[PDB]
Design a protein around this nucleic acid. Structure first.
Ligand SMILES: [Mg+2]
Ligand SMILES: [Zn+2]
Ligand SMILES: [Zn+2]
Length: 164
DNA sequence: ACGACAGATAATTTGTCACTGTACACTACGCCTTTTGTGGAGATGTCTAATATCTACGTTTTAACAGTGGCCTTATTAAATGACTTCTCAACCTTCAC
């Protein structure tokens, strides 16, 4: 062993509005974990691959968030802030993006999936629901490694000027 | 007396020559034995490199398959089908109609 070392893992700081799908994707990339791997590591199994698609029948339970809060050092109350608050309706399929936010903070925001959200009040821009250059839909936020459209390679920060 | 002068005289050798005894008569280096150092085969003993044989050293290659790992969405309501469960399985009397 390395003497006086504590068993450790690569951590990531969650951004102020980062979605759980985006967060788990970064944590998985930081540790080169497959989606099945993190679920086995937390012991919740295939559930992680389901959450990364925003498939929330059922929602992330107290048990499973506290389980993920054992391998991720982020506490379960902060993990619950990566999800819609109680009774806020959300949509999983059309993945959406502000772009002007992504130039400031490279994360998907869970509020971009709310059924009540359509503009960024900070930027006063209509949030995108597909790539404005090539019309390809955005991939699940767990897969936003490159920070660009997977088809035409336009960076999300440039898509800010193609909004509203 | 003895012996001592010059010369006699009985030896001594030098030289002749008639006589005779003998070889020439072909007939020894030759017959035979032993040793002996040199020499010619010719049976026999001497003793190796080497071209294998003759397995093993074990070492690669295969394929079979075993184990790890990723993925796989989840809910409601209706229908069909197959099943399960539960419940039930009175009876005598009155009244008004020919
Ligand atoms: Mg839709
Ligand atoms: Zn914005
Ligand atoms: Zn594009």
């Amino acid at each position: 062993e390395a003497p006086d070392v504590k068993p450790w893992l690569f951590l990531i700081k969650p951004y102020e509005g980062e979605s759980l799908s985006h967060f788990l994707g970064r944590f998985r990339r930081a540790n080169h974990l497959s989606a099945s791997g993190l679920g086995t590591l937390a012991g919740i199994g295939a559930i992680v691959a389901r959450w990364e698609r925003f498939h929330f029948n059922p929602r992330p339970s107290q048990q499973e968030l506290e389980a993920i809060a054992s391998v991720v050092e982020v506490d379960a109350q902060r993990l619950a802030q990566m999800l819609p608050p109680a009774g806020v309706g959300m949509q999983h399929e059309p993945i959406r993006l502000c772009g002007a936010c992504y130039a400031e903070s490279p994360c998907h925001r869970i509020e971009w999936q709310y059924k009540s959200v359509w503009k960024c009040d900070r930027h006063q821009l209509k949030i995108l629901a597909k790539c404005p250059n090539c019309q390809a839909p955005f991939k699940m936020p767990a897969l936003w490694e490159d920070g660009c459209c997977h088809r035409c390679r336009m960076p999300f920060a440039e898509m800010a000027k193609l909004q509203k």
